[PDB]
Amino acid sequence: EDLDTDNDNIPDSYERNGYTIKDLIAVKWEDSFAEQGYKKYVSNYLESNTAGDPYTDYEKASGSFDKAIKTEARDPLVAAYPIVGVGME
């Protein structure tokens, strides 16, 4: 309903069942939203950082972080994480 435990901007049942971010607020997911380009997100309702990266579930889902981060890291289950490496020539 409106109970929030991990203390982000997403309620418990929304994270448990499914939610999408529109107009900077979290709303329940309806299957008719898919054809507009929206995505279904599920997170952990007892943790503020489901993946463990610096950004919380709300920041990742709403795309409220560094705009250079790839759009496939906006779901809470995928971590924003670089794999920098070095090669010699």
Partner: protein, 96 residues
């Protein structure tokens, strides 16, 4: 005015990733600009839509005379200047 602890490196990547680069190369002078684009995949990207003509008008401060943009007195309309793109932009612009 404080200029210590304010780095451009924090905004270089965030700006290059949501913008298109336009370079106007006049005689004995060069200009480079970044104009914000819009992502049509994301439904929550409310950035205003622009065409290349409006982007060129905004970036370099050109003023229309009879529907054709002039920089100061130099014609910059597509029929009076030479446009050069890379392979990706050429492919993305030939189909549109």
């Amino acid at each position: 005015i404080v200029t210590e602890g304010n780095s451009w490196s924090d905004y270089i990547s965030q700006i290059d990733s949501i913008s298109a680069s336009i370079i106007l190369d006049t005689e004995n002078e060069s200009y480079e600009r970044r104009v914000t684009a819009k992502n049509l995949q994301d439904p929550e990207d409310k950035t205003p839509e622009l065409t290349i003509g409006e982007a060129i008008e905004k970036a370099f401060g050109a003023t229309k005379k009879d529907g054709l943009l002039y920089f100061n007195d130099i014609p910059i309309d597509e029929s009076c200047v030479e446009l050069i793109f890379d392979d990706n932009t050429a492919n993305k612009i030939k189909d549109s």
